């Protein structure tokens, strides 16, 4: 089918360099939007970088911008990220994904691997989401609220995420639901102001949500609401 294969990482010293790899099969298009995530331990997803175009611009989050080379081969379909000057900080599960042409969004992921370290005068988009954690019961409806910085129309994506295992995006577009994705999930709202309906809650559900916007780089993820028992 359509996957992407992550490989690379492990355990490395300050100062010291590594390369992930990604190779894409089962591609329908040319040169994709790419990227990199990553996730601190008890932190929240973060974004790395970003490659676009045929001529492979890219883009970098403050944190790496000088350390940190993201490029790719879109002859042998493969993604790579060369970490340079490793600092603790960079201590994370690293995903690379891909933006899909039927919702617009980043819906492909690797598995992840854990790395261990022993202009135009545009605007950055923030998103607050709300609340930070909640306790409920299966059959409970819970809604979780984004507030992005800027008016950003219906260009708001909603992921679960569990524990070690990549992001998987639930909603598109603010309101469309994701393919094989069941139907208790739901979205609303548009500009500055967004909601994620769960209507009837089960036990697969318990998880960590996060709002995130495609569109406008640098791309961002909100904070995450982490609904628990």
């Known amino acids: 089918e359509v996957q992407l294969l992550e490989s690379g990482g492990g355990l490395v010293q300050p100062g010291g360099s590594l390369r992930l790899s990604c190779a894409a099969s089962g591609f329908r298009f040319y040169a994709e939007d790419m990227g990199w995530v990553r996730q601190a331990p008890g932190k929240g997803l973060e974004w790395v970088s970003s490659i676009y175009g045929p001529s492979g611009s890219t883009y970098y989050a403050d944190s790496v911008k000088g350390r940190f080379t993201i490029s790719r081969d879109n002859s042998k379909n493969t993604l790579y990220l060369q970490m340079n000057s490793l600092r603790a900080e960079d201590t994370a599960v690293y995903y690379c994904?891909?933006?899909?042409?039927?919702?617009?969004?980043?819906?492909?992921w690797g598995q992840g691997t854990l790395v261990t370290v022993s202009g135009g005068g545009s605007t950055d988009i923030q998103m607050t989401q709300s609340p930070s954690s909640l306790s409920a019961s299966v059959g409970d409806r819970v809604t979780i609220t984004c507030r992005a910085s800027?008016?950003?129309?219906?260009?708001l994506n909603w992921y679960q995420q569990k524990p070690g295992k990549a992001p998987k995006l639930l909603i598109y577009?603010?309101?469309n639901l994701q393919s094989g994705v069941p139907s208790r999930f739901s979205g609303s709202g548009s500009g500055t102001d967004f909601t994620l309906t769960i209507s009837s809650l089960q036990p697969e559900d318990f998880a960590t949500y996060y709002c995130q916007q495609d569109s406008y780089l640098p791309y961002t993820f909100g904070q995450g609401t982490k609904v628990e028992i």
């Open positions: 577009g603010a309101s």
């Open positions: 800027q008016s950003i129309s219906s260009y």
């Open positions: 994904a891909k933006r899909g042409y039927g919702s617009g969004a980043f819906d492909y």
